[PDB]
């Protein structure tokens, strides 16, 4: 057939599409690992059984076990981020979009986010049809295990004989295996195995970070785009000891005596591999404590993550790395709405009084020193405008600043200091069809559509300015993947460094200056320079 | 004669002027105390010897012993604040401007400033010709002792027999005596002794504060205008213990064995009363330590000042007090230029680098905790504009904010909380002829001319807008003195309270909103609410 490709594991046939005047061959649902079920739950992935007879790659694959967000039942803005194929443990599958230096096309690999608890490669928003066609590049995506299925970490609690029972981070190992699979099969799809770029958003972005710097994988890919997600962010890493405690609570929460873990490991694990996945998928959420602190995250395990995400870069030198990273204007509004939904409304702004500003701020930063609490609270007191709507606005900035934008800023400075070629963007456009309330502004994840080039899709409703910005943001990705540099020629987009922290504003207003330094530096110097000093007694 | 008035001490003849179409009778140089010389140096003032034969009151009186500021030799902007009559210890004289409820005219009494070290009532800038004529009110002014001549405080260091040798604050006692003199002689000048208002600026303003709240004098005047000066400001009060140390250093600095103070007081004082005044006037300045910390200030003496300027108002209730107070835009530039003249220039702005911003800030606030130093420094870091000129600008704001505007703000809130009727202004006009550099903006003391109504003087060069604002600011004073309320009718100028901290902007631009709350509250909440908390460990 004109649509069978001969992979390292066997023959597979996809389907052919015609996007933007270009034929692309779309192969979805290719297995890259054995179905991680039965005794293979919680364990590292193992390469898939070679097959005979061409495998049907025209359907969407299953999504990894996870729970549906139903905070706004029916409301579509929430459900477009829920699974759109059935959930299953049998979920380790790859997708490749392949068009119709000399030795093959570039290959871009997407890693979705969703807080290491949720997410899926099959969401329409991640369709790489347009990107491949207009970019004339190869794009791939894949499911990786999320929640306790990917991050149950119990090894310290057992004898060393049982180390591989639940080592942790196996969702990172999934990505590693899927990435290795693509490098092995790049040439078979028309791709140049040495021309690969990772890109992802939120947790996917943090995973890109992890795949680039892990000792297990360091060297295979040196070119990556991290949208709103870096491993130094608080939600993106977790101690061994915390994971063990969260882990054994899930054990107790599924009625396997976690007290027995130390003396009879084999028995407790057998119990955990007997529980219906739906039960794990629910009870893991008991250990959800406060905002943006999920019970699953990349764990310091002395294996995939040998140390803390700020002791990684003491050492290594990144002369060969090309990095594109950035943020959106209102990273935190979405999370603030969800974790304080008693106060807030997805449609209307909330005039929040002073006492309840203190009550909410003191909640979010309740684990910081009160002298930090006091300093954050003063750094975000309003004095101009109508004070009610501004209080809510300022809590949103505080959330987004502390948890996303300024962790990104800091890592960007760290990378450029060790020699990487870093380019920084800031996404400020509020999509004209956004179904969320106006006060929530430019939402976390709002920029994904644009980098994927969905505004080129004439069947989707977008303003002509929006189509233009979509064309421009997609070309940033393609040019970066192609040359390591997002900048068009005749476009100034200089390198980002601590010495010169310039960033490119992605926006639909053409009256603004699109190169800027000051504003992000002022917001983040609070978090990255000043607040470290008040912690010192 | 048509110009002799019969005072409580004797007959005195002045001269007659015709200002703004009105005849005013000007009596300058009337003695209100014995010349405080010989054994009367350092001591409290004593009422003057009654005289026979009409006393000539047509000349300017002497100015109290003090040193000339010659930082910019020749340059007139500095010298117009230097004495314009000869300096002498024999300086305790009163001036009264008297025009040509039913029982007599209102009486306004001016107290000049100059840091309790300098200043004089005879400066042209304090001429009350226009104010009296256009206001149809009585205006008086007088010299009070400054420097060590008014504030040498040694009583704790001697036996109680010698208490009156140098009790301290005798410059405040001078004012008290001159004020009592005017109340005794109000009716003789056409004035209503019960219709008195004190007003002053800087140290004079702080003295108004002291004259209104001192137990010695509380009750005589309940209506006062404090321009840029309140007793809670750091430069405006000093412990007994500091004064004693500063005092005995001056003793040693004049070669009287201050070690002998405790055992033979009479001898050491006799030595100090033998020193040429020029020597005291110079050597007192040795104890000038850092910016805005002069060696003379109102001293906590358990007599005129019974306690600290924030424990005064725990108790008393001010239902009957009418207070008008305010500030200028750039209180601190003048002092910053003088105390760091190695960096700065009276004509041009200085592009000040980051390191030298730290070096200067760390100097000014070197006695505060470093955690306060750190917090001030962050609260005044620039991020917008060209950073060089802004650093200098921000140090200026820090100086003015901490030393003048926010001490004023705090006391204003304290007064309105105890029942006083407080009205607050903010002066923002840069006089078109100001001889100081542009970066220094609206200088401390720049508003005095306007409240005195000097822009009505057609011989002085002023823009028509400036003449208008002068007419408007003078009418604020007159209406306040007349009714306790600065506001014209048909003009909104509401009361100031912590609940509603509204202030009237005095400016020549007619496009601004002249009533404002936000900006001063944001600047001062740092000094008055937040910084108190970082001091707590
Ligand atoms: C409006 O602006 C004008 C410009 O600034 C002011 O004019 C000034 O007016 C003063 C006082 O009238 C004048 O002062 C001195 O110099 C005079 C000439 O050298 C001299 O005659 C004055 O003194 C007399 O007064 C003394 C008091 O110490 C008495 O002992 C004597 O009896 C003696 O006769 C005084 O030393 C300025 O020179 C003058 N300057 C200019 C440039 O015109 C207005 O005063 C001012 N205000 C008003 C209401 O108009
Ligand atoms: C962590 C992050 C996100 C979720 C919920 N799913 C969402 C995701 C994204 N954007 C969203 C916008 C609105 C509502 C839910 C969204 C962006 C990609 C990751 C998942 C759950 C946990
Ligand atoms: C404390 C305060 C002021 C001085 C110097 N004299 C000055 C006064 C005033 N404004 C001035 C403006 C520029 C230069 C010197 C000025 C206003 C009234 C008090 C004295 C000395 C000590
Ligand atoms: C998904 O839906 C139901 C589960 O309720 C199942 O019977 C069906 O066969 C599933 N479809 C696929 C393609 O797996
Ligand atoms: C002021 O000046 C000199 C001092 O040098 C003195 O001789 C003169 O008489 C003084 N004038 C008055 C009016 O005191
Ligand atoms: Cl083409
Ligand atoms: Cl008239």
CSV table of C-alpha atoms in Angstrom, one decimal, chain A residues 283-427:
chain,number,residue,atom,x,y,z
A,283,UNK,CA,-8.0,7.7,45.6
A,284,UNK,CA,-4.7,9.2,44.5
A,285,UNK,CA,-6.4,12.6,44.7
A,286,UNK,CA,-6.8,12.3,48.5
A,287,UNK,CA,-3.2,13.5,48.8
A,288,UNK,CA,-4.1,16.8,47.0
A,289,UNK,CA,-3.3,19.3,49.7
A,290,UNK,CA,-3.3,22.9,48.3
A,291,UNK,CA,-3.3,24.8,45.1
A,292,UNK,CA,-0.8,23.6,42.4
A,293,UNK,CA,0.7,20.8,44.5
A,294,UNK,CA,-0.3,17.6,42.8
A,295,UNK,CA,0.4,14.2,44.4
A,296,UNK,CA,2.4,13.2,41.2
A,297,UNK,CA,5.5,14.9,39.9
A,298,UNK,CA,9.0,14.2,38.7
A,299,UNK,CA,10.7,12.7,41.7
A,300,UNK,CA,14.4,13.0,42.9
A,301,UNK,CA,15.2,9.3,42.6
A,302,UNK,CA,18.9,9.3,41.9
A,303,UNK,CA,18.1,7.6,38.6
A,304,UNK,CA,16.2,9.7,36.1
A,305,UNK,CA,16.4,12.7,38.4
A,306,UNK,CA,19.8,12.4,40.2
A,307,UNK,CA,19.4,15.7,42.2
A,308,UNK,CA,17.4,18.9,42.7
A,309,UNK,CA,16.5,20.9,39.5
A,310,UNK,CA,18.9,23.7,40.7
A,311,UNK,CA,21.9,21.4,41.2
A,312,UNK,CA,21.6,19.9,37.7
A,313,UNK,CA,23.2,23.0,36.1
A,314,UNK,CA,26.0,23.7,38.6
A,315,UNK,CA,28.1,21.5,36.3
A,316,UNK,CA,27.2,20.8,32.7
A,317,UNK,CA,27.8,23.2,29.8
A,318,UNK,CA,25.2,23.8,27.1
A,319,UNK,CA,27.1,25.4,24.3
A,320,UNK,CA,25.2,23.0,21.9
A,321,UNK,CA,21.7,23.5,23.2
A,322,UNK,CA,19.0,25.7,21.5
A,323,UNK,CA,16.1,26.6,23.8
A,324,UNK,CA,12.9,28.5,23.0
A,325,UNK,CA,10.7,29.2,26.1
A,326,UNK,CA,8.1,31.6,27.4
A,327,UNK,CA,4.9,32.3,29.3
A,328,UNK,CA,1.3,33.7,28.9
A,329,UNK,CA,0.0,36.9,30.5
A,330,UNK,CA,-2.3,35.3,33.1
A,331,UNK,CA,-0.8,31.9,34.0
A,332,UNK,CA,-2.5,31.8,37.3
A,333,UNK,CA,-6.2,32.8,36.8
A,334,UNK,CA,-7.3,29.3,35.8
A,335,UNK,CA,-5.8,27.7,38.9
A,336,UNK,CA,-7.1,30.4,41.2
A,337,UNK,CA,-10.6,30.0,39.9
A,338,UNK,CA,-10.5,26.2,40.5
A,339,UNK,CA,-8.9,26.1,44.0
A,340,UNK,CA,-11.0,29.0,45.4
A,341,UNK,CA,-14.2,28.4,43.4
A,342,UNK,CA,-16.2,29.3,46.5
A,343,UNK,CA,-15.2,32.9,45.9
A,344,UNK,CA,-15.0,33.1,42.1
A,345,UNK,CA,-17.0,32.7,39.0
A,346,UNK,CA,-15.8,31.6,35.6
A,347,UNK,CA,-18.0,34.3,33.9
A,348,UNK,CA,-17.9,37.4,36.0
A,349,UNK,CA,-15.2,39.3,37.9
A,350,UNK,CA,-15.3,39.3,41.7
A,351,UNK,CA,-15.1,42.4,43.8
A,352,UNK,CA,-13.0,40.9,46.6
A,353,UNK,CA,-12.7,42.8,49.9
A,354,UNK,CA,-9.5,43.4,51.7
A,355,UNK,CA,-10.1,40.8,54.5
A,356,UNK,CA,-10.8,38.1,51.9
A,357,UNK,CA,-7.7,39.1,49.9
A,358,UNK,CA,-5.7,38.4,53.1
A,359,UNK,CA,-7.6,35.2,53.8
A,360,UNK,CA,-6.9,33.9,50.2
A,361,UNK,CA,-3.2,35.1,50.0
A,362,UNK,CA,-2.5,33.7,53.4
A,363,UNK,CA,-3.9,30.4,52.2
A,364,UNK,CA,-1.9,30.1,49.0
A,365,UNK,CA,1.4,31.0,50.7
A,366,UNK,CA,0.5,29.5,54.1
A,367,UNK,CA,3.7,27.3,54.1
A,368,UNK,CA,6.0,30.2,53.5
A,369,UNK,CA,7.4,32.3,56.4
A,370,UNK,CA,5.0,35.0,57.6
A,371,UNK,CA,7.8,37.5,56.8
A,372,UNK,CA,7.5,36.2,53.2
A,373,UNK,CA,3.7,36.1,53.5
A,374,UNK,CA,3.9,39.7,54.7
A,375,UNK,CA,6.2,40.7,51.8
A,376,UNK,CA,4.2,39.0,49.1
A,377,UNK,CA,1.0,40.5,50.4
A,378,UNK,CA,2.5,44.0,50.3
A,379,UNK,CA,4.1,43.4,46.9
A,380,UNK,CA,0.5,42.7,45.6
A,381,UNK,CA,-1.6,45.3,47.4
A,382,UNK,CA,-3.7,47.4,45.0
A,383,UNK,CA,-4.0,51.1,45.3
A,384,UNK,CA,-5.3,52.2,41.8
A,385,UNK,CA,-8.6,51.4,40.1
A,386,UNK,CA,-11.6,50.0,41.7
A,387,UNK,CA,-10.1,48.0,44.5
A,388,UNK,CA,-12.4,44.9,44.3
A,389,UNK,CA,-11.7,43.6,40.8
A,390,UNK,CA,-8.0,44.5,41.4
A,391,UNK,CA,-7.6,42.3,44.4
A,392,UNK,CA,-8.7,39.3,42.4
A,393,UNK,CA,-6.4,40.4,39.6
A,394,UNK,CA,-3.5,40.7,41.9
A,395,UNK,CA,-3.9,37.3,43.5
A,396,UNK,CA,-4.0,35.9,39.9
A,397,UNK,CA,-0.7,37.6,39.1
A,398,UNK,CA,0.9,36.4,42.4
A,399,UNK,CA,-0.2,32.8,41.5
A,400,UNK,CA,1.1,32.9,37.9
A,401,UNK,CA,4.2,34.8,38.8
A,402,UNK,CA,5.4,32.5,41.6
A,403,UNK,CA,4.4,29.2,40.0
A,404,UNK,CA,5.1,29.7,36.3
A,405,UNK,CA,6.6,32.9,34.9
A,406,UNK,CA,9.3,33.6,37.3
A,407,UNK,CA,10.4,29.9,37.7
A,408,UNK,CA,10.7,30.1,33.8
A,409,UNK,CA,12.6,33.4,34.0
A,410,UNK,CA,15.1,32.0,36.5
A,411,UNK,CA,15.8,28.8,34.5
A,412,UNK,CA,16.2,30.9,31.3
A,413,UNK,CA,18.8,33.0,33.0
A,414,UNK,CA,20.5,29.8,34.3
A,415,UNK,CA,20.6,28.2,30.8
A,416,UNK,CA,22.0,31.2,29.0
A,417,UNK,CA,24.7,31.4,31.8
A,418,UNK,CA,25.9,27.9,30.9
A,419,UNK,CA,26.1,28.6,27.2
A,420,UNK,CA,22.7,27.6,25.7
A,421,UNK,CA,21.2,29.8,23.0
A,422,UNK,CA,18.0,30.9,24.7
A,423,UNK,CA,15.1,32.7,23.0
A,424,UNK,CA,12.2,34.0,25.2
A,425,UNK,CA,8.7,35.0,24.3
A,426,UNK,CA,5.6,36.4,26.0
A,427,UNK,CA,2.1,35.6,24.8
